[PDB]
Design a protein around this ligand. Structure first.
Ligand SMILES: C[C@@H](CO)Nc1ncc(Cl)cc1F
Length: 119
């Protein structure tokens, strides 16, 4: 029932994501010199360094907010991909599955802790 536990759990999950090779295209903002039309398709860029920095600055109030930004990294990759078979998009699907598998307990524990707080 620790209402604050999600933060370190998210830091550790981001550490695992950064250790994974599949995260390399998503660790920093998409390079507009490499993909000059990126902002014509993507309205809200997002990357794992921005998520980590937001978390470390104390600018997420809940793990749901962090989860919304991580999911935006994946939806941007899906919206920008020219093919559902593309390399970068394929890496995003594996990273997404790993992220969802691990964030589920973080979200559950946080929501359970908040319900206990308001019992
Ligand atoms: C924790 C690590 C242990 O080797 N396994 C993984 N880490 C990251 C991804 Cl995206 C997929 C994995 F299977």
């Amino acid at each position: 029932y620790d209402i604050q536990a999600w933060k370190k759990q998210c830091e550790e999950l981001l550490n695992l994501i950064f250790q994974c090779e599949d995260s390399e295209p998503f660790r920093q903002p998409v390079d507009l010199l490499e993909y000059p039309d990126y902002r014509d398709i993507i309205d809200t860029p997002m990357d794992f360094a921005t998520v980590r920095e937001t978390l470390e600055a104390g600018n997420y109030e809940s793990p749901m907010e962090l989860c919304k930004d991580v999911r935006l990294i994946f939806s941007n990759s899906k919206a920008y991909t020219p093919s559902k078979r593309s390399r970068i998009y394929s890496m995003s699907l594996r990273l997404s599955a790993f992220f969802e598998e691990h964030i589920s307990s973080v979200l559950s524990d946080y929501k359970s802790a908040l319900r206990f707080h308001k019992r």
